Design a protein around this ligand. Structure first.
Ligand SMILES: NC(=O)c1ccc[n+]([C@@H]2O[C@H](COP(=O)([O-])OP(=O)(O)OC[C@H]3O[C@@H](n4cnc5c(N)ncnc54)[C@H](O)[C@@H]3O)[C@@H](O)[C@H]2O)c1
Ligand SMILES: NC(=O)c1ccc[n+]([C@@H]2O[C@H](COP(=O)([O-])OP(=O)(O)OC[C@H]3O[C@@H](n4cnc5c(N)ncnc54)[C@H](O)[C@@H]3O)[C@@H](O)[C@H]2O)c1
Ligand SMILES: NC(=O)c1ccc[n+]([C@@H]2O[C@H](COP(=O)([O-])OP(=O)(O)OC[C@H]3O[C@@H](n4cnc5c(N)ncnc54)[C@H](O)[C@@H]3O)[C@@H](O)[C@H]2O)c1
Ligand SMILES: NC(=O)c1ccc[n+]([C@@H]2O[C@H](COP(=O)([O-])OP(=O)(O)OC[C@H]3O[C@@H](n4cnc5c(N)ncnc54)[C@H](O)[C@@H]3O)[C@@H](O)[C@H]2O)c1
Ligand SMILES: Nc1ncnc2[nH]cnc12
Ligand SMILES: Nc1ncnc2[nH]cnc12
Ligand SMILES: [K+]
Ligand SMILES: [K+]
Ligand SMILES: [K+]
Ligand SMILES: [K+]
Lengths: 462, 464, 460, 461
């Protein structure tokens, strides 16, 4: 009532979004348990959170949990294609500043982040940052250092964002402490792996409706995302080959029943077309990049791929595939939103019945969020419970209020304690109806733990 | 071969030629280990090493032993389990002139005597300077009974999760006398051996012991660590309906996401010591229970009383006390079907009806079932574990802890893992053994993610 | 051209882009275009067609037209049409009456618009049907039209059942081909199609995580087999119900627990017969039977709160949706997704926790909440359809003397050689290479190098 | 003083009996028939020549036939498939059996002849139970006068049924037969799921090789090839499938396998040049499943990757050209039923030669040769069908019919679907499964009886 501090595609989608938020709450017991547990305490009272993460229904439940615990927020998405417009509308209609829609331009994307940072033309009195991929963190460090003086911490969602934070810490340019939310086991080995297992074949089916059974896939990478991606395709009946630079990850792919191959002859990427295994790439129906690295599906790979193969990326940033090369040299035909045929016959025009094209999904951006709805609520429950606990921890530590000598001792990138990781996990297990056994005192003594946990040393890999 | 060689004890030396044939095949399945042989034989990095070894005397252990010898070591060997030896492996090693005391089906008394035969030579302590152990039993006997021998020993290389736990307790209590390398927690060990090895060998052992169809039947796996993960997959891939018990909610979360129902033998997960706390409806539907925990009494007497008639009971953790077999020895009549397979008749202690329908089938008398009823992990998986073992032996032997002044000894008394670079190099050889091709980063790519082109590729915190 | 009714003709360009992609996914059907285009075997055919107006059906329609036929087309389900496909067909000058979200009355009107042209019965002479509704309307309401029709080609298990009942009763008036029971139809479509498209539809409709949750699949025929796999491969804990013990044996061997919603399997009509403990743990129930009331009112009352309920059999009476309409309040989440509030009939609390989620109002969920089977699977079914249309049209039953008709009035299948030829084109679409027997090897196993490679009794 | 047998070691009998008692608890359909029919003695007067793998599972079948009143004389249908403790237990029960693991081909023939003859003269046989058709062939070729008094043959396996249908076509089949193979509770239980259980079992027992991550080629994708492909894929192998039947190949593709041919463009012209050497050089394991001849031929064997494993799970050992390997290459026995074949030549071998293949069971049925064949709970279905087929043909009394009526009954038939379903129901109850009962309204709706049969005879499952 009088609220205009937002920008979304269509505010009238709010009732639809609210219906889906009410369903999603029933799928997110760890997050909803934190609401119940901390509602009276209001641990985020006085927190003012700049948030930059995919404006989905799941992020909706995260936002309203932070608000229910006392926080004020200003929100944007961390990707131009990942917003669910009904989710953004429901948040805006609740009176929460959100600047996000599906299908932003790069200029609009940056404008949206700037609308969270500034309120009424001046820096908002922010004191906390929640980020997915590091874009908001980078803009604050480069353009708003005075704001960081009053910010107590950053809670960072994803592998790429943490790598950026560690580079800043190494270079002495990180200005506030961070929690690496990614490396909770209830994030990394739930979201990154099982979330992509669910949502990769989901996005491919929505975008192309292609049969996957019996066809040949190449997954570039076998980290947490590459593992879940390979399972997403293999469980559909795809014949999956895996590429890797890490021999330990490659070993896992072999033992998991995949053939390990390289796009390059003997794995040597010397920049020549001669180095491409053309016989291999000419048999591939689907390539998926999962690395967080640059140019792992390069121009010469794209030139050699089988006619009508599907090309997509589920890493955080669109530079895993050389889409710039495709924009410069080949003609793009939109099939429908986030689905383009790339005609390898030339740049100027195309024949509508040309057989020599590739299908690119989400213009090379995160395909699970761009062509579907990303991870399901019950998986995001784990990631976002960690986010709320991380926000509580850094806000209560009050880094910005500490003397300089004390700041120096606390300026770090840390993970949440294992005990909290376990508490998130138990809520997830209860949501499945699972029943965990309680150790007897003698059994706890025998393996050297407290009955209530933690149950594993910090070195344990799960 | 050595003339007059008698410094061994095995079941049947005539199996040696068969053992040797299998060692030659196994060498072709163990490229990381054989690559170490080829790379280091001329350097002789273990020349002067005198290694006491205690680990399952299988064909795979034979390839490890002869790798250490080829690098210059002398060894004296025993098995770390009474049922895990392959007698043809023991025979081939003995026939090669290597002291080995090991056979399938030892008594507990014979088991201890075999370890002591490695420790002693001609009635007196051998001048050992290295220890290679699997489960901690040899480590324990040396500290307990021959503490003076530890004054000349440079290190212990410990293979398995249970043994590392014992070393860490000793370290924290000030009772560990020499430094050790935790071989178990190399990724090419723990996440290869413990998981994939059990995937291969659990269903193998159940089939050899019982020849039961597994598809369509109900299993309960106690534990979902690395062994529990691999065990659950061994059964699920055969078509079993697998339920998983855990005390660790993170491991339980993984089981749910992996497609398993998580359940407890106890109502509400609480064991109050009474029969009434047992979920009798659940246990009365289970055809197979497998313990994987490294913990004590996780398949207890009340659970055994509640199990469905003719269910199979087995343990793939390191020690037999996961299952309360002592209760079953005390109260129920054992009928041997064949070696390492017993029907346990719940009708009473004194005799049994040959056609009684109320029995359980116990495999390997509750000892490690993959080694007891089959041959344990396959060579190509043990390649990773045993390559790490050789590298750990070389590292500790070259460090020469026993020759350091006591000040430097306090600074080095630790339980360490091998560096990730070595872990990666073992993995690369394994991948090449499958014919896999690892891609090489470009310089720009390596800069982009902040690694060297040669690795390591992951920070030490990475969990894979 | 105005002889059509679709949701939005401006979607035609989009539909045409998707048809061009689908053609590249349907090698058996496009091979039939290439090999029969010269002969024009359907020249003079006037085909009434009633099947889901999807992109895949568009490629089928345009194949029939490419071989010489005229058609008039409708969907066989109110929710299965892809509006861009109908638009592209209408824009091509082909009469089609079909949109996503028809009412039952509009559904019947659409079939009647294919039957009538300019207020009079079209001079149709062939029938292509999926489910038997068009076949039924012709026999009951326009029986004189059947005197000019040479044959019916029926797509699905339910429709074949209806054809056989009519043949047994002496009420079938023209010969038919059972397309369903080509192996490249039944053992491709019914099973593998549902494997692809069931989890697809559930994700699109709910975006629920399936891994770790409990499913109950009612039925384990071809659709139940593919459905059970669609869920188990996502990591669901799947239980299977069956009345057929052979199918139940397969479910056990395939690694599923076989259960009944009723104590000891006995459905005696009472709430007391419901296994309430079982149903109270189920997160998802899927019906696959082609039978009536296999997810009944007492089961729906006993289901776990917030369970998803859906049907992938042909007709919406597998679930007792009428009971839910009568007794419980429906809250639309979005098209083809309803929360059914078990708290009562008149109104609901927006935050009530005691609801079920029904997909597609109990209608075919893969077509209702997603896009049905994928092109490369529908390729097998629709190549068989084309071959069956060619066969019956060239036979010209409607022109035979009465004595020759009596010996021709049957429900037949296509010869195994054609089944094998469809399969060969599908295998080449995957890049697979089929080996050729040597003469000695063919002699050894008692077949021709040319095939057929199996007796008609072989079950694959 | 019972001496009418020949087994490896009669002192194994107590061990065999312990395993039979366990197996009975795993075979509820077969033991159900025992309890149902023991009082009626439907096989009283039956005198059955039996030729099928002398396993523990066959022991339960034999003792079911005897419990129902039959007398039998038994041999194995494969030289490597007998479980010697099973044979001993049967012989110690006073049942004539001539079978041991590791027969020569001459011993194999002699064992069949010992069942046919008693005291040097034809036994008064009147029923035949066969697996593969060898006993059937010897009777037609050498003992036609015995067939005049035989009421029928119950044949277990695909290859034997083919041999029966050839005789029927040629007019040389002398007695009617039941095709036991094509019950659904046989073909789509035993042939498929039995090989799923027992193929990777035999490979592990023979080689202890890791299978995960390695490349397999399965020749054939019928019932045995389907189960064999699953046996390997579920272990983590990368499995490729070859087929001559495009419908079976379509199934392999849709089931998630790559379909390949050993021959370039699938053309087997007999030349080395036709071999896809790149493909064969990547294969770690080849398994033949076809019932055909020479599907793993000499040129494939020459092209295979060094140290690949070669085995056959079809009925006969000519699927692999082992004759070529005997003639050209040196064989080194690793242990019983496991040989290294050294491709370096015929005259001896280097013990450390790297260029060898590993052949299992000398190319004979690998699941029975290197392990124990299918498990009891699967053989329960096949062998309940066998008992029911024996009862049916014995009660028909074909040998006693007039010539004109014999001509009308000389056929190869399957059991009716109601029997198939009742066998399946007992199997499902053995898993604890609960089948639902149709209401009258539902039965009318789909047009079946509440008790079944639930499917038309054309249904393929
Ligand atoms: N789309 C999603 O929902 C989602 C979810 C989580 C993470 N992510 C993103 O996905 C990316 C990967 O994350 P992760 O957690 O799997 O990281 P990870 O470190 O666990 O895995 C990345 C893998 O890529 C491999 N790799 C790097 N360069 C390669 C090359 N040239 N060829 C082949 N393999 C190569 C590395 O060896 C590594 O194993 C990051 O950008 C992360 O932020 C996306
Ligand atoms: N047989 C083999 O070849 C083999 C191979 C490797 C390791 N092991 C042995 O197996 C055991 C387990 O090894 P690991 O590497 O899997 O260890 P791990 O710590 O990774 O897993 C053990 C799991 O057991 C769970 N657990 C403990 N007590 C429990 C209880 N009461 N109920 C249910 N779950 C319980 C723990 O939470 C833990 O996740 C050790 O004894 C190890 O030495 C055996
Ligand atoms: N949605 C799709 O894309 C699609 C595709 C093909 C077929 N169908 C339809 O799906 C239905 C099934 O087709 P099908 O080919 O699998 O038929 P089918 O005969 O192969 O299988 C139906 C199964 O349901 C079982 N069944 C019947 N009543 C039952 C009950 N009360 N409880 C449990 N099981 C019961 C039968 O025993 C049988 O095995 C038909 O209506 C068919 O037209 C839908
Ligand atoms: N070992 C066992 O326990 C066991 C069990 C059952 C049957 N069998 C035997 O296995 C064999 C196969 O039985 P089945 O029931 O699977 O028969 P089947 O007819 O179902 O399958 C055999 C398949 O082999 C294919 N084939 C034939 N020649 C081929 C070639 N040159 N290349 C590739 N594929 C080729 C055929 O197309 C067919 O699909 C028979 O000999 C049978 O008696 C063995
Ligand atoms: N085969 C094997 N040899 C030695 N140690 C083992 N641990 C597990 N399997 C083993
Ligand atoms: N165990 C077994 N017994 C008899 N015949 C068989 N055929 C396959 N496995 C068998
Ligand atoms: K989602
Ligand atoms: K082994
Ligand atoms: K579709
Ligand atoms: K067996």
């Amino acid at each position: 009532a009088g609220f205009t501090d937002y920008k979304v595609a269509d505010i009238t989608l709010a009732a639809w979004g609210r219906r889906e938020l009410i369903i999603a709450e029933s799928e997110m017991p760890a997050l909803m348990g934190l609401r119940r547990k901390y509602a009276g305490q209001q641990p985020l009272k006085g927190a003012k959170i700049l948030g930059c993460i995919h404006m989905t229904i799941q992020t909706g439940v995260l936002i309203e949990t932070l608000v229910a615990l006392g926080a004020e927020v200003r929100w944007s998405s961390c990707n131009i294609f990942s917003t669910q417009d009904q989710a953004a509308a429901a948040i805006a209609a609740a009176g929460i500043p959100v600047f996000a829609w599906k299908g932003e331009t790069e200029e609009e994307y940056e404008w949206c982040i700037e609308q969270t940072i500034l309120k009424d033309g001046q820096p908002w009195d922010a004191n906390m940052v929640l980020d997915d991929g590091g874009d908001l963190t980078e803009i604050l460090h480069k353009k708003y250092p005075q704001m960081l003086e009053r910010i107590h911490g950053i809670t960072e969602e994803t592998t790429t964002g943490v790598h950026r934070l560690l580079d800043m810490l190494k270079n002495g340019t990180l200005k506030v402490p961070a929690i690496n939310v990614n490396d909770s086991v209830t994030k990394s080995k739930n979201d990154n792996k099982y979330g992509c297992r669910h949502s990769l074949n989901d996005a491919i089916k929505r975008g192309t409706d292609h049969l996957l059974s019996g066809k040949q896939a190449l997954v570039i990478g076998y980290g947490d995302v590459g593992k879940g991606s390979s399972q997403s395709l293999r469980q559909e009946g795809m014949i999956v080959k895996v590429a890797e630079v890490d021999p330990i990850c490659a070993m896992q792919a072999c033992m998991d029943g995949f053939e390990v191959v390289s796009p390059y002859k003997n794995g040597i990427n010397d920049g020549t077309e001669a180095s491409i295994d053309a016989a291999l790439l000419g048999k591939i129906d689907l390539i998926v990049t999962t690395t967080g690295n640059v140019n792992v599906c390069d121009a010469n790979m794209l030139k050699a791929l089988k006619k009508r193969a599907v090309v997509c990326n589920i890493g955080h940033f669109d530079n895993e595939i050389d889409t710039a090369f495709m924009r410069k040299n080949w003609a793009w035909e939109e099939v429908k939103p986030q689905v383009h045929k790339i005609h390898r016959t030339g740049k100027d025009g195309f024949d509508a019945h040309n057989d020599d094209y590739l299908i690119l999904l989400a213009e090379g951006r995160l395909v699970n969020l761009g062509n579907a709805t990303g991870h399901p609520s019950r998986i995001m429950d784990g990631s976002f419970a960690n986010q709320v606990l991380a926000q509580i921890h850094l806000f209560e530590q009050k880094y910005a209020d500490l003397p300089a000598a004390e700041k120096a001792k606390r300026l770090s990138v840390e993970v949440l304690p294992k005990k909290l990781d376990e508490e998130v996990a138990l809520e997830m297990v209860k949501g499945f109806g699972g029943v965990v056994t309680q150790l007897t005192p003698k059994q706890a003594e025998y393996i050297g733990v407290s009955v209530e946990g933690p149950f594993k040393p910090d070195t344990y890999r799960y």
